Amino acid sequence: VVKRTMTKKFLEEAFAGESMAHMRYLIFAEKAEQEGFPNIAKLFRAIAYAEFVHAKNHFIALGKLGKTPENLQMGIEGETFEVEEMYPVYNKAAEFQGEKEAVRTTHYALEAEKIHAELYRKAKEKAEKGEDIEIKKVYICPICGYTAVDEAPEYCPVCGAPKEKFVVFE
């Protein structure tokens, strides 16, 4: 594990840089596919995976990867931070500055993070006992990120998108 202050800071910045590059490429791949460039989209997705490898490598060097129970905990804290601190404030700020678009994206994220924090809490209770959670599939709204396990509402409670549009993980 890296211990020197400056190098740790640099690896942290590189992890953030790699994460954003990976994210942009997933976004670009989707856009390229919609524009009629399937091979360019394929290129973006592959490189996005390469950035995942870079990010994971820095992540491990910082010694931030642990066992599932500990990983779920990192998740619980991050989600909880976004629910109680970050998004409420960013949302209130956007409201205050009249940026309706930002008011919407932060509202979208916030409601979903509330669900994430809870699912991770339930999951840890299991993992911590050496047990896997019992879930068949997960629904994710492609519009606002609303998340549902096993059973989904007919329409997204946040944006109202029909269930037919939810991305399914099974």
Give dist(CA 49, CA 44) in Å, integer. 9
Burial environment of residue 69 by CB neighbours within 10 A (0 to 12, 13 to 18, 19 or more): middle
Beta bridge partners of 149: 138
Residue 151, interface with its own copies (CB under 8 A)? no
Residue 35, number of CB atoms within 10 A of its CB? 10
Residue 134, interface with its own copies (CB under 8 A)? yes
Residues 20-49 that bind its own copies (CB under 8 A): 20-28, 30-32, 35-40, 42-47, 49
Distances (CA, A) of 60 to 33, 53, 71, 127, 148: 33, 11, 12, 21, 30
**By C-beta, is 127 or 141 nearer to Fe ion?**
141
Q: Encoding tokens for residue 42?
A: 């394929």
Among 76, 118, 128, 132, binds its own copies (CB under 8 A): 132
Q: How many residues touch its own copies (CB under 8 A)?
A: 102
Residue 54, interface with Fe ion (CB under 5 A)? yes
Known binding residues for Zn(2+) are 18, 51, 54, 79, 82, 113, 116, 141, 144, 156, 159
Q: Applying CB under 5 A, which residues contact Fe ion? A: 18, 21, 51, 54, 79, 109, 113, 116, 141, 143-144, 146, 156, 158-159, 161
